[PDB]
Nucleic acid binder design. Structure first.
Ligand SMILES: [Mg+2]
Ligand SMILES: [Mg+2]
Ligand SMILES: [Mg+2]
Ligand SMILES: [Mg+2]
Ligand SMILES: [Mg+2]
Ligand SMILES: [Mg+2]
Ligand SMILES: [Mg+2]
Ligand SMILES: [Mg+2]
Ligand SMILES: [Mg+2]
Ligand SMILES: [Mg+2]
Ligand SMILES: [Mg+2]
Ligand SMILES: [Mg+2]
Ligand SMILES: [Mg+2]
Ligand SMILES: [Mg+2]
Ligand SMILES: [Mg+2]
Ligand SMILES: [Mg+2]
Lengths: 124, 26, 143, 214, 176, 41, 97, 46, 202
RNA sequence: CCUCCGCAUAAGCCUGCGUCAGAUCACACUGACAAUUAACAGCCCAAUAUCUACAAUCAACCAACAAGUCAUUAUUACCCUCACUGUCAACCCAACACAGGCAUGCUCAUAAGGAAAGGUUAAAAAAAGUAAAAGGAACUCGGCAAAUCUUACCCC
RNA sequence: GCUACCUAAGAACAGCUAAAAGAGCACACCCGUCUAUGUAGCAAAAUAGUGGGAAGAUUUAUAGGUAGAGGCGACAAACCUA
RNA sequence: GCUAAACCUAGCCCCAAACCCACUCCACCUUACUACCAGACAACCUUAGCCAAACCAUUUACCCAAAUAAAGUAUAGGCGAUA
């Protein structure tokens, strides 16, 4: 009989089976005409690598560092530290319109945006 | 392992008897 | 490029697929067989494309790259444990990167040539071997 | 890289050996020698202020007699209390399957404390003190075989002995004691008693291509 | 270059290369996004160096000089990933109110189990999709007996675990 | 396996002690010993 | 050889446990308590075997009735096969007709 | 003639015959996979 | 670790422990009293008194705690003798070896009487759990053992790949309502004018 | 000395005689470390309508029957690249280092590939051959086997 | 995935006779007449020799089809995983 | 004196009680464990037989909504077996 316990890879099966299965690398283009491959640049991932000249953060931290209590960032903390000053400083001045929250940051829709948070359209 | 005590006790007295007829006491 | 993440679909006329924090991690490996002077061998993930190893090495390490070739190396499934269950050595991707501008790489040599242990060595050096003429007599009694 | 390490209760050597003087047995710089000693003796009394070097020699003789008597009955527990871990194997290993019959007849002359030296502190936080004591006694010895046959010595006959026994106590340890560490045999020592059997020393077992070159 | 895949040449064969503590998640929360991006690439180059060194140690049958460096760089980048994902999760929950980044649905299956179908990205709609309509998100009535037998097996395993729990407790109280 | 026989040894020896002067496997193998010990009695 | 070579671990018994010491108490609760309870209501066990004996066929018929509804499938099937086998054995086989 | 060489392997045949998609294609094959998950098999299909 | 693993003197993963406990070992489990973390009196470096066996009534410093078997290894005490370096017909050197002791075989000592006491855990005014004696009533602190990592703070000089405590703690994060991708694109000045069109998600 | 083999592809299998270290018919076993790199092969193609009678056989002559394996056009639409995967071995199906089974191209004649004898003695019986005086089917159910290479005739 | 029959699209067949062939000799290839060996074997049907066919109702690679109250069969009550 | 022999613990059984189990990421109905394309198909039919009737041909108990009792009673049934 055949081995039905190991992983089914692209190394097994006949020519057609071997060429039609891959290893999980994402596609960077399409196939046309005489099995001719057209690579599409926008489908090729571009590595956004920053300038590291003048950077003071090294891979390890000195052991002479004070211990800090862990505090996971919440949406409550983000609201209290990002838009709450604006809302308070606009209410005490008395110019809060409860219909234009767009000026405080609120995004009604995520459409038309380049980096939409739901459904996510951006890589890590 | 079988349950019980009586056969094990009998076997120990048999073992003690043979050890005596093997290395007899002075 | 990145592992284990959904990729945003591209419809013609759309933005560039950009990655910002890639989780692609490669190893420079000493070649087992003899290679040309321009060849650098890497072990890369299965989901890393040669277009992305070129882009990775030219973006993060600023290495001019002329050619990239890849192969899939199979790990053995022959080995068995005490339950007669086969243990799988993994599969990896090997990549051969040929450098540009006439540059040349050779793999360097990264490995060039206790009170208890000193106690053990001192006792071993103090303990002389038994004299044959002593016959087997204990050698401590001064008598 | 565990935080537990071996807690050694002795050392593996002799601290500044007493080169036995030629003529010490044939006849029936001193300030520096006895200076190193006094400096160290004070170190020992820093670690325990009830030590008298005038009181050591009789204790050393008692430890000697009782240790060597353990070798007669094989009391390895008492031996580990009157002798160091450095002295245990080279006192027991060659007697393991033999019968040792030892006795102490008398002492020809009283025992003398003849050297006191101490190690530094940097031995793992432990500081040891090592005292050399000369002995000239009269002992008997008869080492028997696995089958009860004589190999060495005579049963009743006492013979003279000169030994420079080096005792050691670990001073930092709270329950440390004075135990027998080694003994110096002089390089000028008299030759020992002949054994009771004949011995063949083999020559070179030669491979066939080799030639016997005398 | 490739000298950045290798260590400093003065560290080669030094049997121990000292290190520093891994980045703690709170410290990475103190730093900003752009600095976390740059630190991600610094830590990435360090991890590539350490993985290269570990593979060459395996090749030469010698111990790796200090594997704690590799462990601590993996912890540092895990903490960085955690911080960035928390910031995105907080903004997504603030702006859209959705608690996951990928869409999905609780659905049934051809086997009668309830699964979290994670959605895939398509160009045509679902009624026109061939492969999607070949898949069955419903259990026909011959699955209920196997569901009952599956539940009964889970009950037989739980009852065993809890009886042994009590037997082990009584054996402990027998000894002490 | 509640209630098993635990003294079968002593039963086999009660038969076997009367066969120890016999010749062959019947002096030690119970299945042949019994047949010959009943006949000796 | 099928006999222990050593003595078994000793089997110490407390004849004065709370359970041993109070065995049998309230077993005359009806005749000494104005017949308000029954010792069969003192019995604690399976719900189909409180104050009833039966043989094996009667026990199997009784359990399928009181708890065959709330019963696992494999164990119910096995009970049905057991009742069928015991019906055939008790009604058709034996030495005494 | 001589027997025993009745398995003439072919991956296309083995996947078309006893594979997951064929199994799920019939309800009885669905119950074959259900029977194997209940037994706890590590290879439900081929 | 495999179930019913027998903890011993060697750490679980060493060469001696891989020899003692192979992947196929199945031994009888060791029955261990369930002593919780909220009631473990023995720590490392604490001075205890051995009460049972040879070395009875004797005070030492514990050098190892194995919580999985309620074991303390007191430094130098409960000792047996074993050779080390037995390679050729060389005997090796006899070393003293410590056998572990149980928490009912050791008892903590109060720092003045230097006699066996009994500690009961009691929160203090600062909320610090503190070992309070039962005969007397003072506080025995947790003894300072060097560290688990092996890093001693006083002699810590940062190397070429360690970030300075100052830079490590420089707060650069202004909390905003934008993403790392959005911020990094603005910072690095990448420009994108093409719009991401709607994708049917199912 | 043998070569009825061989070398490739296909299918199948899936690290299965590469290096290092290590044991206990004769020394392909265990653990570790490596390796198969695309141009060969796989993986193809916008729509709607529309078009497509005349074999192959050296395609010529010629003869066929069983009557055959290879073709477009019109008008819209259309900018971009060399991705992904197979690539090792003494190998697969026959419970086995099984005298069996196993598609195609080349060599079929060897430039590939291999070894019938562990050592001796030289009894019977048995196996496989070679030679055999005179005779020549007398053998046997039968010229079975072997050797020659050979006539005529029944029944179905 | 054997085998019986079928579908789709493939492949192979030297040399000689006569040139018309379900023609003859004859390889590869397909089968299996007779004998000997083997009979827990090399083999749950093999080996050596001898044979039948070998341009045809041939042989054969691949994918597909028909399933048991059935299928399939140039009827042997054949074959449908020893 | 070789081969051996011994061993108590993994765990399990019957009850009681109590309503059991599903989103690290990613992948998975196509040749499952395959990023990414013009379709659509779709679930519901009385079990039967072994066996007993000493063959067998009508017939031959199979939880169906807490115990007990009425009661193996009325009834049914090649008025047989049996129900
Ligand atoms: Mg090509
Ligand atoms: Mg090849
Ligand atoms: Mg050759
Ligand atoms: Mg040969
Ligand atoms: Mg031979
Ligand atoms: Mg002739
Ligand atoms: Mg004739
Ligand atoms: Mg005749
Ligand atoms: Mg013939
Ligand atoms: Mg013909
Ligand atoms: Mg012919
Ligand atoms: Mg036919
Ligand atoms: Mg017929
Ligand atoms: Mg017939
Ligand atoms: Mg009948
Ligand atoms: Mg009958």
């Amino acid at each position: 009989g055949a081995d039905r316990m190991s992983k089914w890879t692209s190394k097994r099966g006949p020519r057609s089976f071997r060429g039609r299965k891959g290893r999980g690398a994402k596609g960077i283009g399409f196939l046309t005409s005489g099995w001719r491959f057209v690579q599409i640049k926008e489908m090729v991932p571009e590595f956004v690598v920053p300038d590291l000249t003048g950077f003071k953060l090294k891979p390890y931290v000195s052991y002479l560092a004070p211990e800090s209590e862990e505090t996971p960032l919440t949406a409550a903390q983000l609201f209290s530290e990002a838009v709450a000053p604006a809302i308070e400083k606009d209410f005490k001045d008395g110019t809060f319109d409860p219909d234009n929250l767009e000026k405080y940051g609120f995004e009604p829709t995520q459409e038309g945006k380049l980096f939409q948070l739901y459904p996510r359209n951006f890589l890590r | 392992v079988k349950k019980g005590f009586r056969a094990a006790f009998r076997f120990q007295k048999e073992l003690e008897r043979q050890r005596l007829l093997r290395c007899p006491p002075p | 490029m990145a592992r284990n993440v959904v990729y945003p679909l591209y419809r013609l006329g759309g933005p560039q697929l950009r990655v910002f924090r890639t989780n692609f991690f490669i190893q420079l490996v000493r070649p087992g067989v003899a290679q040309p002077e321009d060849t650098v061998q890497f072990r890369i993930p299965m989901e890393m494309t040669r277009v992305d190893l070129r882009n990775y090495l030219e973006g993060i390490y600023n290495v001019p790259v002329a050619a990239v070739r890849t192969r899939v190396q199979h790990g053995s499934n022959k080995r068995r444990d005490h339950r007669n269950v086969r243990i799988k050595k993994p599969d990896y991707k090997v990549a051969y990167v040929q450098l540009a501008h006439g540059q040349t790489f050779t793999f360097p040599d990264l490995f060039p040539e206790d009170d208890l242990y000193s106690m053990l060595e001192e006792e071993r050096q103090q303990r002389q071997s038994s004299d044959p003429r002593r016959g087997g007599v204990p050698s401590w009694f001064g008598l | 890289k565990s935080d537990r390490s071996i807690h050694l209760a002795c050392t593996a050597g002799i601290f500044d050996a007493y080169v036995p003087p030629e003529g010490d047995a044939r006849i029936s710089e001193r300030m520096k020698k006895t200076m190193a000693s006094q400096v160290s003796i004070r170190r020992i009394k820093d670690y325990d202020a009830n030590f008298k070097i005038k009181d050591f020699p009789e204790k050393a003789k008692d430890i000697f007699i009782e240790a060597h008597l353990c070798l007669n009955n094989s009391d390895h527990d008492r031996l580990h209390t009157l002798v160091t871990e450095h002295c245990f194997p080279d006192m027991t290993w060659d007697i393991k399957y033999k019968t040792v019959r030892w006795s102490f007849v008398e002492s020809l002359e009283p025992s003398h404390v003849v050297q006191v030296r101490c190690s530094s502190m940097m031995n793992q936080g432990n500081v040891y003190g090592q005292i050399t004591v000369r002995m000239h006694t009269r002992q008997t010895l008869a080492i028997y075989d696995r089958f009860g046959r004589l190999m060495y010595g005579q049963e009743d006959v006492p013979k003279d002995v000169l030994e420079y026994v080096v005792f050691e106590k670990q001073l930092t340890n709270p329950y440390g004691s004075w135990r027998m560490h080694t003994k110096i045999v002089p390089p000028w020592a008299p030759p020992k008693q002949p054994i009771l059997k004949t011995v063949m020393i083999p020559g070179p077992q030669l491979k066939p291509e080799e030639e016997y070159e005398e | 270059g490739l000298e950045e895949f290798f260590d400093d040449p003065k560290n080669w064969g030094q049997e121990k290369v000292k290190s520093g503590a891994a980045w703690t998640c709170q410290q990475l929360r103190n730093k900003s996004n752009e600095d976390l991006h740059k630190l991600w690439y610094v830590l990435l180059k360090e991890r590539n160096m350490l993985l290269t060194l570990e593979q060459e140690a395996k090749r030469q049958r010698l111990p790796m000089p200090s594997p704690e460096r590799l462990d601590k760089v993996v912890d540092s980048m895990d903490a960085l990933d955690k911080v960035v994902q928390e910031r995105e999760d907080a903004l997504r929950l603030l702006q859209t109110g959705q608690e996951r980044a990928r869409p999905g649905a609780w659905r049934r299956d051809i086997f009668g189990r309830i699964i979290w179908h994670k959605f895939k990205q398509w160009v045509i709609p679902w009624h026109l999709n061939k492969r999607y309509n070949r898949k069955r998100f419903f259990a026909l009535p011959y699955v209920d007996h196997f569901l009952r037998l599956e539940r009964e097996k889970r009950a037989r395993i739980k009852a065993r675990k809890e009886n042994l729990e009590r037997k082990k407790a009584k054996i402990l109280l027998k000894k002490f | 396996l509640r209630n098993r026989v635990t003294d079968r040894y002593f039963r086999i020896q009660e038969v076997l002690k009367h066969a120890r002067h016999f010749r062959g496997r019947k002096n030690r193998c119970y299945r042949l010993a019994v047949r010959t010990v009943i006949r000796a009695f | 050889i099928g006999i222990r070579l050593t003595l078994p671990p000793p089997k110490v018994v407390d004849r004065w446990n709370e359970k041993r010491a109070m065995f049998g108490v309230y077993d005359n609760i009806g005749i000494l308590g104005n017949f308000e309870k029954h010792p069969k209501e003192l019995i604690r066990g399976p719900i189909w075997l409180r104050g009833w004996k039966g043989n094996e066929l009667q026990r199997c018929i009784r359990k399928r009735k009181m708890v065959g509804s709330r019963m696992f499938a494999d164990d119910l099937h096995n009970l049905n096969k057991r009742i069928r086998y015991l019906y055939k054995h008790f009604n058709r086989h034996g030495k005494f007709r | 003639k001589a027997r025993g060489n009745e398995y003439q392997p072919s991956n296309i045949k083995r996947k078309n015959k006893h594979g997951w998609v064929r199994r799920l294609s019939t309800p009885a094959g669905v119950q074959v996979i259900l029977r194997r998950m209940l037994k706890g098999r590590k290879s439900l299909s081929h | 670790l495999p179930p019913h693993y027998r903890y011993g003197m060697s750490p679980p993963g060493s060469v001696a422990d891989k020899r003692k406990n192979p992947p196929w070992i199945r031994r009888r489990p060791v029955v261990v009293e369930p002593i919780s973390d909220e009631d473990w009196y023995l720590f490392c470096g604490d001075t205890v008194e051995i009460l049972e066996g040879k070395d009875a009534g004797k005070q030492g410093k514990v050098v190892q705690v194995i919580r999985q078997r309620n074991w303390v290894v007191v430094g130098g005490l409960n000792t047996h003798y074993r050779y080390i370096g037995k390679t050729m017909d060389y005997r090796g050197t006899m070393i003293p070896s410590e056998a572990p002791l149980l928490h009912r075989q050791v008892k903590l000592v109060d720092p003045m009487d230097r006699k066996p006491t009994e500690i009961e855990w009691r929160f203090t005014e600062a909320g610090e759990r503190v070992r309070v004696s039962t005969r007397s009533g003072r506080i025995i602190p947790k003894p300072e053992f060097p560290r688990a990592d092996g890093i001693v703070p006083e002699t810590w000089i940062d190397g070429p790949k360690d970030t300075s405590v100052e830079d490590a703690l420089e707060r650069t994060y202004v909390p905003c309502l934008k993403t790392l991708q959005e911020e990094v694109m603005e910072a690095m000045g990448i420009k994108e004018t093409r719009k991401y069109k709607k994708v049917y998600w199912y």
